[PDB]
Write a protein that binds this ligand. Structure first.
Ligand code: BEF
Ligand code: BEF
Ligand code: BEF
Ligand code: BEF
Ligand SMILES: [Ca+2]
Ligand SMILES: [Ca+2]
Ligand SMILES: [Ca+2]
Ligand SMILES: [Ca+2]
Ligand SMILES: [Ca+2]
Ligand SMILES: [Ca+2]
Ligand SMILES: [Ca+2]
Lengths: 515, 511
C-alpha cells in the first residue's frame, strides 16, 4: 500500500468531489464518510494516514469526531476543512491539536500543501538539510581558514551551531563526519587564536570581547538602570550555547527574547574563576587582593563559590546602585522547588540573582558515570537531556513565577563544556578532572595546552613565581600518569571544562521581556 | 498585553492593504518591506514575532530570504504567502522549516488562523485540554465503577494513560488532583479485584489474562512459527505502560505496530519472579521444582536472574522448536554499544533476545543519585527522561540495526513500578515480603498464607507472602520516622497496581 489514505468526513461530500478528483490525480486515496459516527468506525477498522473533518455537521461536530478519533489513534494528523471563520471555532480546533485548519472555499493546492506539510515534512527537511549542507560545507571549511578575529570566531561558531542542530537527525554518516571534522578543526584553530591573543586582551585599551569580569557592569547594569521592570538574573552553571539552543523554544512560551550577546568566559573556563568573576566584577587576582577573606585558591579546602552574594553586593555598592537585591544558589531539586514555591516573597526586589546548578556530568562513582554516559554519550544526547531537564526543572517554575510578576529575565552562564576525546599526561599536580591545572611543579605535553608561566598577566593568582597554569586545547583531557589507562577509559567521552574551545568559552547572554 | 509584531515581505505591498488593515483591526502590528534584503536588515535590528514572505520577488526570492533569516534567528516562525502553486516550491518551503504556506488569493481569516496556530497554540491546548477533562472526568469515574473484568481493567487503564499524558501540561491544580484521585481509586479497586481473583486464575480452565509464565508460549511462539522474518525480542526491565506511551512515536520511525497485547505480570511484580517466568515458561514454584540448580529464593546470596538464557533454551526445547537463538543481558552503556555495533553478526538467528536493564537502573537512581532526582522528580519528568534516554540509547541503535536486517520486533517488559506514598507497618524490596511470623495491616496488603496456591515457593507452612496494594510501602516499625522520610516518593515494584502489573507486549514489522 504505497498510496496515502485520506479519510474525509463532511455531510456534503457531493460538493467536495472536485477536490477529491484533484487529490486522486495526485495519487491520494480518499475514503469519504458523511457523518462523524460512521467515520469513527471506519477510523477504528482501517489505517488512514490522515483525516479531514468538516466542523458543522448535523450529528457529531468535527471537533467531537476529532476528540473520539484522537483517543483511539492520537498520532494520526487531523485537518479541519470548514466554512466556519469564527475565532472561537478556530481556538477550539487549535486547542484540540488540529494539525491544520483550512477555510472553505479552499484552493485544492492549499489542501495539497497541507498534506505535504503534515505527512512529508520530516523527509523533506532531512533531504533539504542534507543537500544544503552538501553545498555549504566547503564554504564553511574555507571561512574557518580565514577567521582572524574574536568576532569572526563568534560568527563561525554560530554557523557550526546552526548546522549541528540541523544535522542532528539526518542519517547520512558521511555528512555527519564532515561536520565533526569541521568542529575539530574549528577548535584547533580557535585554540591557537586564544593562545596567540589572550594575553594582549589584558593590556590597557585592548580590543577584547566582553568577559566574565566585565559581564555585570557592561550588560546587566544597563538593564537595571532602565528601571522599567524588576530583574530575575539567572546564571545556569556550565551551560553551552547548544544547550541554550535546545530549550530556546520552550522558554519562548513565557518570555520574548529582546537581546542576545555572545561573550567570552575568562580562563580557566571554570566556576571558581569565571563565575566568581561575574559576581565580583574583578579578575581572580583582584579578588585575591581586594577580598582575601572570600577568595580561595585551588590549594584551599572547601567550597570555591561560597561568597558570590557577598561579591555581588560589594560590586553593586562600588557601582553606586541602590537597589533591593537578593542572591540564591540552587544546588538541588529541593532547594529549587522551595524557591519556586516561595518566589512571590521577592515581588518587591529590584534584582533576584539565581545560580542554578545543572547535573554533575563528572561523577567519581562508576555507576553514576554509567548513567550519565547512557543519557549524554554524544552532543545530540546532551542536548536532548538538557531539554528534558529544562522542561521539568524547578528553574522553569521560577521563570514562570517571575513572568507572572512582570519580571524581566536575564539568562546567562559562566562557561560551557566539551566532550573530551584525547588524553594528555600531566605530572606533579597535587590537586579534580578539569581542562586546566595549576601548580609549581607541573610537567605536561606543551603542544596540547596553552601555558602561562606568568599568571598575574592574565588576572590569575600565583602562589609564587614558579606557579603556572596550563589550559587544555582541542578535545584534550588532562590525565594523571598513575592509573593512566583506567583514567583514560573512565573520562573519555565526558563533558569537561576549564580549557579552550568554542563550546567552553563563547557563551550566551540573553535578555527577555515577559509575554 | 503587548502587540504581536509581523514583518511582511512582498514586492506588491499595495495589493496587501486589505489584509494589513484586517490584521491591524485584530491588534497585530504589521511592518512591511518590499524586498528580502531590506527585510533581512529589519529582521536583524528588531524582534518580530513572525515573518510573512512572498516567494516571487525581484532580487532575493522568499526562499532565499527565509534561508538567511532562519540562520540569523531560527526560532522565529515564518509563513510563506505566495501565488505559487508549484509543488517543488511547496516542498522547498516545507523542507526549509516554514511554519505555514498560504496560497494567494488568501482569505484574511486563513492568515488569522495561521497566526493563532503558530503563536497561541500552547495556551489554547492547555485551556481546551482542561475543559475537555472537566467535561469527561465524571464519565471516567462511572466507567471505573462498571469495571467487572480484566479486559475492562485494561481499557480503563488505557483511558487513564491517555488523560495522564494530555494533562501533563495543564496548570489547574483542581483538575490535576481529580485525576490523581481517579488513579488512586483505580488502584484501590484494581487491588481488590486482584486480591479476589488471583488465586482462582490458577484453577483449570479459568478465564484469565496472559501472564508472565504464559507470555513466551502464547505470544512469542506464534510469531516464531510464521517463519517469515527473524525476531528481535526485547525485554526492557521495569517499563511502565506510560513510558511505552512516551516513546511510541519514536519507534514508529523504524517499526510499524502489528499487534499490542496488554498482559499481567505475576506476583510479586519483580524481576526474580516475573522475568524468570517469562524465560522459563513456568511459575517460580515450578522453577524451584524443575530447575533447583538455577532457581534462587530471596534468602540465597547473589544475582537472582543469572540463568535466563538457560531457562529460555530449555523452554524452547520443551516447546519442540528448532531455532538459532541467542540471549544478551545489557547492564551498561559499553555492553549496549558493543551489541549495537556488532548486531549484524546475528543476521542468521531466528531469535535474538535482549534484556536491557537501564530503565530499572533509572527508577532506583531517582532516589539515590542527585542527577536523576533532579531529572525524574515526578511522573511527567520520569517519562520525559525516559524518552530522552530512548531516543539516544544503544537500545534504539540495536533496534535500527534490526530494522535494516528485516527483523521483526517484539518489545515487552517484566513489570512496571509505582511512586509509593503511604507507609504500612510490618515486622518480620518494599512492595512484597515473605517470611514466617509477619505483622501487617491486612487492609493494606494481599495476604497469601499458602504460597504454593499461586505458584510461589515456601520455606515452611508458616511462611507466607504479602503484597502491597495501592501506593503503600511496607515500613519497619523500628526507625519508622526515618524509613518514611527516606522511602516516600520513591519508585518501588513487587506489589499490585496498574502501573506494576498491566504491561505492554508489542509486535512490529520493519518499515
Ligand atoms: F459545514 Be462546514 F464546517 F464546511
Ligand atoms: F548566508 Be547563506 F544561505 F550561504
Ligand atoms: F510574487 Be508571489 F510568490 F505572491
Ligand atoms: F531487577 Be530488581 F532490583 F527487582
Ligand atoms: Ca457541513
Ligand atoms: Ca561553572
Ligand atoms: Ca613563573
Ligand atoms: Ca511578488
Ligand atoms: Ca551568505
Ligand atoms: Ca524487573
Ligand atoms: Ca529494581
Amino acid at each position: 500500500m504505497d498510496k496515502i489514505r485520506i479519510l474525509w468526513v463532511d455531510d456534503e461530500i457531493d460538493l467536495l468531489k472536485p477536490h477529491i478528483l484533484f487529490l486522486e490525480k495526485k495519487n491520494y486515496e480518499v475514503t469519504t464518510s458523511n457523518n462523524g459516527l460512521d467515520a469513527i468506525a471506519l477510523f477504528e477498522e482501517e489505517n488512514f494516514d490522515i483525516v479531514f473533518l468538516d466542523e458543522n455537521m448535523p450529528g457529531m461536530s468535527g471537533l467531537e469526531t476529532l476528540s473520539e478519533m484522537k483517543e483511539k489513534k492520537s498520532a494520526i494528523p487531523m485537518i479541519m476543512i470548514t466554512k466556519s471563520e469564527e475565532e472561537y471555532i478556530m481556538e477550539e480546533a487549535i486547542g484540540s491539536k488540529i494539525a491544520d485548519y483550512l477555510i472553505k472555499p479552499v484552493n485544492p493546492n492549499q489542501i495539497l500543501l497541507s498534506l505535504k506539510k503534515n505527512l512529508d515534512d520530516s523527509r523533506l527537511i532531512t533531504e533539504k538539510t542534507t543537500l544544503d549542507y552538501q553545498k555549504e560545507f566547503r564554504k564553511i571549511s574555507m571561512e574557518l581558514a580565514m577567521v582572524n578575529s574574536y568576532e569572526d570566531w563568534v560568527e563561525l561558531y554560530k554557523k557550526l551551531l546552526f548546522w549541528e542542530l540541523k544535522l542532528e537527525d539526518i542519517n547520512d554518516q558521511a555528512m555527519i563526519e564532515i561536520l565533526e571534522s569541521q568542529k575539530v578543526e574549528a577548535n584547533s584553530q580557535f585554540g591557537k587564536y586564544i593562545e596567540r591573543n589572550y594575553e594582549d586582551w589584558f593590556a590597557p585599551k585592548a580590543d577584547k570581547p566582553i568577559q566574565s569580569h566585565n559581564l555585570f557592569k557592561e550588560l546587566v547594569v544597563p538593564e537595571i538602570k532602565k528601571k522599567d521592570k524588576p530583574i530575575l538574573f539567572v546564571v545556569i552553571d556550565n551551560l553551552r550555547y547548544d544547550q541554550w539552543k535546545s530549550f530556546e523554544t520552550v522558554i519562548s512560551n513565557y518570555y520574548k527574547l529582546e537581546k542576545e550577546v555572545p561573550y567570552f568566559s575568562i580562563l580557566p573556563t571554570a566556576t571558581q574563576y569565571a563565575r566568581n568573576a561575574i559576581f565580583s566584577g574583578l579578575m581572580p587576582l583582584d579578588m585575591e587582593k581586594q577580598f582575601p577573606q572570600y577568595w580561595k585558591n585551588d590549594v584551599e579546602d572547601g567550597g570555591k563559590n561560597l561568597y558570590e552574594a557577598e561579591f555581588l553586593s560589594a560590586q553593586i555598592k562600588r557601582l553606586g546602585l541602590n537597589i533591593k537585591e537578593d542572591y540564591f544558589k540552587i544546588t538541588n531539586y529541593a532547594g529549587g522547588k522551595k524557591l519556586a514555591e516561595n518566589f512571590k516573597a521577592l515581588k518587591g526586589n529590584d534584582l533576584v540573582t539565581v545560580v542554578y546548578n545543572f547535573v554533575d556530568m563528572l561523577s567519581h562513582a562508576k555507576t553514576e558515570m554509567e548513567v550519565v554516559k547512557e543519557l549524554a554519550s554524544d552532543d545530540k544526547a546532551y542536548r536532548s537531556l538538557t531539554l528534558s531537564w529544562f522542561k521539568n526543572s524547578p528553574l522553569l517554575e521560577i521563570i514562570q513565577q517571575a513572568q507572572l510578576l512582570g519580571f524581566k529575565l536575564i539568562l546567562t552562564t559562566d562557561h560551557g563544556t566539551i566532550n573530551v576525546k584525547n588524553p594528555s599526561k600531566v605530572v606533579g599536580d597535587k590537586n579534580l578532572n578539569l581542562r586546566y591545572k595549576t601548580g609549581r611543579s607541573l610537567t605536561y605535553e606543551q603542544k596540547d595546552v596553552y601555558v602561562v608561566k606568568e599568571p598575574k598577566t592574565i588576572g590569575l593568582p600565583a602562589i609564587n613565581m614558579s606557579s603556572s597554569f596550563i589550559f587544555a586545547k582541542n578535545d584534550f583531557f588532562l590525565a594523571y600518569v598513575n592509573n593512566y589507562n583506567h583514567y583514560v577509559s573512565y573520562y573519555k567521552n565526558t563533558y569537561q571544562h576549564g580549557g579552550i574551545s568554542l563550546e567552553e568559552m563563547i557563551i550566551p547572554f540573553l535578555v527577555f521581556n515577559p509575554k
